[PDB]
C-alpha cells in the first residue's frame, strides 16, 4: 500500500507497478511562462461513477474536467495560455466475486461525435457512450474498438489488478495553448468484458478518477 | 555550351520520380518543429501493438461490443473448440480488421511472426484449464482436444495465470506471403479447447468471457505497398 | 526485420496522388461564363486514399511537391487551328486573398508565386514547404474558435481566341519529408462518401 | 577464347525487343467502345525470340527496362486539328488490381506508378526491378497450386475531343542485369505458333 | 528576432511582378496600323505595388531581371494555320534612340541588345544591370534642370503573313540585388489612380 | 554529348525562381555605389521607429 | 543556368542504347538472390557440352 501525497491531498494506491506512461514521454516543463507548481499540482478526485451491467462507457476531456477544480481551474481561466501533463489514477474497487474488465484509453485530440461546446465539454461529471451520446465501440468516430488499443491505455481486469494509472505528457501541435478552448487529452473508459457478480453481491461497483496535473505552467495572468 | 543529348524518358512525369523541384516560397522561413510526444517512424510500429481480435462476427454481435468476447459457459461439454482462428491475417475476416490487418491491407507481401494473447476476464475465484493449440500450415485444424494436445499446445490454468501469450512462428516457402492468396487457407489455426470445465465457487456466474489480442512480432515486415481504398 | 524501409513513413506517404482535376476555358468572347479560371483550396479532405493514410495519425508536418498535368481539347468541331496556350498556375499562400475574376488584382500580385506553363511541354512543378502556423498539421483538433495549405488558381493567359478550348489540369500532390505523430485507429473506408 | 563477351548472358539477353503493340483511342463522345484504354499483362510468353532465349535456362532474375514508343493518327479524314495528347502509362505491379473502366479508381491510386507521356517528345521509360516472390523467375515449374511481372495500362488523358485519334504504343522490353540458371535443350521454333 | 530574413530588403523587393502588357500584331498586308511594334519605357511609376514599395525609401540601386511571357492568338476565325512566329525583343538602353517604324534603323543597330524569342518555348529573359548615371536611383529629387532604365521594343519578325495574329507580351520585372536608402513615410494607396 | 533527361518543371517560368540570367549589357561598366548615409538593410528597422498613434479618428 | 547545346541524336530511342532510367518502384526492396546451383555466365558454356550428332536424318 503506497500512500501518495501532493500538498493538501493524499491517495491510497495499491502500488504503482502497472503504470502506463503515454508515448514513453514523461511530462516536462517547456525547455516565458510561469510554473504554478505550488498547489495547483495536487490530486483532484472526481465524482465516482457506478458501473452497472448495462454500462457502455464513460469519458472525460482534459483539462475540461479540471475546470471547476480549485487552483488549476482558476489558473486555467485567468491565464490565457497553459500546458499540463497529468497522472490519471483510475481506481475501481470491487470484491473478489465481481468480474469484468475496463479499457482505459487516453486519447489525443479526442474529438467525439454522435459538436457544440457545452455538449463536447461535460466538465467533472463526464459523458457516457451508448450502444447526445457517442457510439461506444466507435468513440463517436467510426472506429472499430479493438483498434483503440493503439492509444495510450491500460486494462483494469477485475480478477487481476483493480486500478490503472496513466501518465500523460502534454500532446499538442503547439508548445503552449489556451486551455479554456482546446482539450488536448481525452479519457475514455469502456467495459471490455461486462460486469457480472455473484448472486446478491454489490450490483454496481464504483470507479474513481484521480487527476494530478503534472508540470503545469501558464501565461499570462489577467 | 556543354553539348548534351536528351535521352528517352525526358519530359515524362513519372509519379514515382524523385527530383529537386523549385520551391514557390523561397524566402519563407518555415515554422520549426517541436518534440511532440508519440512520433512514428514506421507503420510497423502500429502493427507491433496488441489490438483486439473480434471473434463473433455474427449479424447480431458484429459491430457492437459483443463481437470481441468469447463466452465460456459450463453448458454441455463438447470437444469442438471454444474458438478456432485461422491466421490468414488479411484474408481471415476476424484478423482482417485488426490494426495488423489494416496495415496488411496496404501491402502486397508480408512476413514474420504473430503474437496472440488471450485474456481471461472472469471471476478471480474461477479455476480450470484451457488448451491453446496451434496447428501449423497445411494441417487441417484439430476437431478434438486430443488431436490438438498431441500437436503444439499450451495448457493454461485460469487460476494461476490470467493471460496467455503465444508467438506463432514464421514459416513460408517464399521469403514473404501474399495478402490475397489463391483463396487458399494455410498456415495458422489457433484453437482453444477446454481441458477442464471451469470451476466456480458459491453462486459465481458460470458464464465468463475471454478476450483475444494480436500483434506483429519484431521480426515482422511488409513490402510492395498496394493502396486499394476507394469509393 | 528484413529492411522494414518500405513501410517507413516516407515510403508510406510520399507517393504521387491526384488530388483534383481543375477545368478552365479559353477566353473566347462568345458566351464563356466565369469558368475562365479555376480555383481550389489545397485540401486532402476530398481524396480518400491520402486522407485515410494521414488520419492514421494525429499530427504531421510535410512539404508538398505539387505537379501539374495540363491537357486541352477543342470544344466544338470548329477546330481549324489555335496557337499553343499558356497557363498561369498561381499558388496563393495561406491567409492571402483568392481570385474572384479572371483578371483580378491577385493575378499580378508579387506575393502569390505563379507558374507560366506552356502547353505541350514537361509538366510544371512547385514545392510548397510547410506553411503551418502551428508546429504540426492537426488532422483532429478538439477545440473551438482545420488547417490551411493554400489555394491553387489556374487560368489561360491568352485573350482573343476564336475557338473554345477546354483544358483540365491534374494536380499530383506528393507529400515530401513527412513526419507524423500519435497513431490512431484508422477510420473505415465506409464513411467517406 | 578471344573476348567471349559477346556471348555473355548480358550481351545475349539484354536487347531491346518489342513485346507488344497496345492500341488506344481518344475519348471521343461519338461511339467509342471500351478501346478507350488498353491493358496488357507483362509476359514474354507471346514474343518468340525472347521466350526461346529464356527457355534455354530454367531459372532467372532480371530487371526490366520498358520503353514506350507512342504513335497516333487521325481515324477519319475529318482531321482539321487536335491538340497534343497526353498518355497515362500506368505500371500496375504484381498482385494489384487491374483497371476495368477508362476512369476506374486504379488510375488515381497512389500505389500504381504512372508515366504522363506527352506526344511528340522523347520515348517514355521506366525500369521495373525484379518483382519476383521467389528468388528467381521460374520458366518451367513441375508443381501445382507461371510468374507475375505486372500489368501495363495505357489511356489518353484528354476528354472532350471532337476528332477520333487512334494511337499505338510499342513496348520495348530490354531485360537488364540478367542472371540465369540450369541450361536446357532449346525448344524448337516449330511449336510456338 | 527569429530569422528576420523574410523582411530583408532583398526578400521584400525581389519578386516577379508584371509591369506591363505589350501588344503587337503580325505584319499582315491587310490594314494593319502602326501596332506592328510595341514600345514601352521601363518605369515602375505605373505599377502600384512596386512603386509603393520603392517609395518607402529615397534612393536605390538594383539590377533588373526582366522576363517575357509571349502569348498569341488568331484575330479572326480564318485561322487555317500559321507558322511559329519569332519576336524581336529589343532592350534600348538609356539615352539611345527609340524605334519609330516597324523597320527603323534601330532594330538592326549593334548597340541595342535584342532577344529573338521563338513562340512556344521557354520564356525569354535578360538581366539589365544598374544603368544609372547617378550612384543611386532617385525616387524623389527636389531639384530642377526621374531616371532612365531604358525602353523595351517588341515586334514580330515575320513579314508576309496571310492571317492576323495578335500577341501580348507580359514583362515580369524582378529587381535583383536591391539596396535602398533613407526610409520615408509610405505614400497611401489612395492616390495612385 | 553528355546524356541528360529533361525533368518536369522545365520551360516553366516560376516567378519565384532564382537563376543566372544572361545580361543584355555584358560589357557595360556599372556606375559604382557610394556610402549614402541612411542605408536600410531590413524593413523591420522601419518598425523599430516610434511613429505616432492616431487616437481620435472621428470624421472631424 | 548551365548553358547546354542539344546535339544530334537527341530524343531518339536507339534500342541498343544503355542509360540510367527512372525506376517505377523506387522504394520496393527486391527479393534477394540465392545460390541456385547451375548458374550460367556465358552461352558458350552450353557449347562446351558434348551433345549428340544425328547422323541418319532420313524421313524414317
From Swiss-Prot, chains C, D, E:
It is found in: Virion; Host cytoplasm. Interacts with capsid protein VP0, and capsid protein VP3 to form heterotrimeric protomers. Five protomers subsequently associate to form pentamers which serve as building blocks for the capsid. Interacts with capsid protein VP2, capsid protein VP3 and capsid protein VP4 following cleavage of capsid protein VP0. Interacts with human PVR. Forms an icosahedral capsid of pseudo T=3 symmetry with capsid proteins VP2 and VP3. The capsid is 300 Angstroms in diameter, composed of 60 copies of each capsid protein and enclosing the viral positive strand RNA genome. Capsid protein VP1 mainly forms the vertices of the capsid. Capsid protein VP1 interacts with host cell receptor PVR to provide virion attachment to target host epithelial cells. This is Capsid protein VP1.
Amino acid at each position: 500500500v503506497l500512500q501518495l501525497t501532493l500538498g493538501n491531498s493524499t491517495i491510497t494506491t495499491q502500488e504503482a507497478a502497472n503504470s502506463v506512461v503515454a508515448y514513453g514521454r514523461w511530462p516536462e516543463y517547456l525547455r516565458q511562462p510561469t510554473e504554478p507548481d505550488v498547489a495547483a499540482c495536487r490530486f483532484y478526485t472526481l465524482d465516482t461513477v457506478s458501473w452497472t451491467k448495462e454500462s457502455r462507457g464513460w469519458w472525460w476531456k482534459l483539462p475540461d474536467a479540471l475546470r471547476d477544480m480549485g487552483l488549476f481551474g482558476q489558473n486555467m481561466y485567468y491565464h490565457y495560455l497553459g500546458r499540463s501533463g497529468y497522472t490519471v489514477h483510475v481506481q475501481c474497487n470491487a470484491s473478489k466475486f465481481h468480474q469484468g474488465a475496463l479499457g482505459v484509453f487516453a486519447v489525443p485530440e479526442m474529438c467525439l461525435a454522435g459538436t457544440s461546446y457545452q455538449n463536447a465539454n461535460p466538465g467533472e461529471k463526464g459523458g457516457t457512450f451508448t450502444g447526445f451520446c457517442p457510439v461506444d465501440y466507435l468513440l463517436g468516430n467510426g472506429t472499430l474498438l479493438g483498434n483503440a488499443f493503439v492509444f495510450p491505455h491500460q486494462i483494469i481486469n477485475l480478477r487481476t489488478n483493480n486500478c490503472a494509472t496513466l501518465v500523460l505528457p502534454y500532446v499538442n501541435s503547439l508548445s503552449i495553448d489556451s486551455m479554456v478552448k482546446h482539450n488536448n487529452w481525452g479519457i475514455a473508459i469502456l467495459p471490455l468484458a461486462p460486469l457480472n457478480f455473484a448472486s446478491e453481491s454489490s450490483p454496481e461497483i464504483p470507479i474513481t478518477l484521480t487527476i494530478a496535473p503534472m508540470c503545469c505552467e501558464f501565461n499570462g495572468l489577467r | 555550351g556543354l553539348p548534351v543529348m536528351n535521352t528517352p524518358g525526358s519530359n515524362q512525369y513519372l509519379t514515382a520520380d524523385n527530383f529537386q523541384s523549385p520551391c514557390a516560397l523561397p524566402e519563407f522561413d518555415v515554422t520549426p518543429p517541436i518534440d511532440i510526444p508519440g512520433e512514428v517512424k514506421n507503420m510497423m510500429e502500429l502493427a507491433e501493438i496488441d489490438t483486439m481480435i473480434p471473434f463473433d462476427l455474427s449479424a447480431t454481435k458484429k459491430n457492437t461490443m459483443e463481437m470481441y468476447r468469447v463466452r465460456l459457459s459450463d453448458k454441455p461439454h463438447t470437444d469442438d473448440p471454444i474458438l478456432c482462428l485461422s491466421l490468414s491475417p488479411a484474408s481471415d475476416p476476424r484478423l482482417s480488421h485488426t490494426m495488423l490487418g489494416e496495415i496488411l491491407n496496404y501491402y502486397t507481401h508480408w512476413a514474420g511472426s504473430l503474437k496472440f494473447t488471450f485474456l481471461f476476464c472472469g471471476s478471480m475465484m474461477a479455476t480450470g484449464k484451457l488448451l491453446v493449440s496451434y496447428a501449423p500450415p497445411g494441417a487441417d485444424p484439430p476437431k478434438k482436444r486430443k488431436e490438438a494436445m498431441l500437436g503444439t499446445h499450451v495448457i493454461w490454468d485460469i487460476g494461476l495465470q490470467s493471460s496467455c501469450t503465444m508467438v506463432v512462428p514464421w514459416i513460408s516457402n517464399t521469403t514473404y506471403r501474399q495478402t490475397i492468396d489463391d483463396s487458399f487457407t494455410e498456415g495458422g489455426y489457433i484453437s482453444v479447447f477446454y481441458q477442464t470445465r471451469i470451476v466456480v465457487p458459491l453462486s459465481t456466474p458460470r458464464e465468463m468471457d475471454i478476450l483475444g489480442f494480436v500483434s506483429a512480432c519484431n521480426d515482422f515486415s511488409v513490402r510492395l505497398l498496394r493502396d486499394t481504398t476507394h469509393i | 526485420h528484413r529492411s522494414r524501409s518500405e513501410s517507413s513513413i516516407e515510403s508510406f506517404f510520399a507517393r504521387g496522388a491526384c488530388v483534383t482535376i481543375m477545368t478552365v476555358d479559353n477566353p473566347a468572347s462568345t458566351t464563356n461564363k466565369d469558368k475562365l479560371f479555376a480555383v481550389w483550396k489545397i485540401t486532402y479532405k476530398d481524396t480518400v486514399q491520402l486522407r485515410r493514410k494521414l488520419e492514421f495519425f494525429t499530427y504531421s508536418r510535410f512539404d508538398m511537391e505539387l505537379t501539374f498535368v495540363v491537357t486541352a481539347n477543342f470544344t466544338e468541331t470548329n477546330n481549324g487551328h489555335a496557337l499553343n496556350q499558356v497557363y498561369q498556375i498561381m499558388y496563393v499562400p495561406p491567409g492571402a486573398p483568392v481570385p474572384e475574376k479572371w483578371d483580378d488584382y491577385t493575378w499580378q500580385t508579387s506575393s502569390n508565386p505563379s507558374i507560366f506553363y506552356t502547353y505541350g511541354t514537361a509538366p510544371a512543378r512547385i514545392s510548397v514547404p510547410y506553411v503551418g502556423i502551428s508546429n504540426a498539421y492537426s488532422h483532429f483538433y478538439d477545440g473551438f474558435s482545420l488547417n490551411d495549405f493554400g489555394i491553387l488558381a489556374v487560368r489561360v493567359v491568352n485573350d482573343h481566341n476564336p475557338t473554345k478550348v477546354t483544358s483540365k489540369i491534374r494536380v499530383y500532390l506528393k507529400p515530401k519529408h513527412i513526419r507524423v505523430w500519435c497513431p490512431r485507429p484508422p477510420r473505415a473506408v465506409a464513411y467517406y462518401g
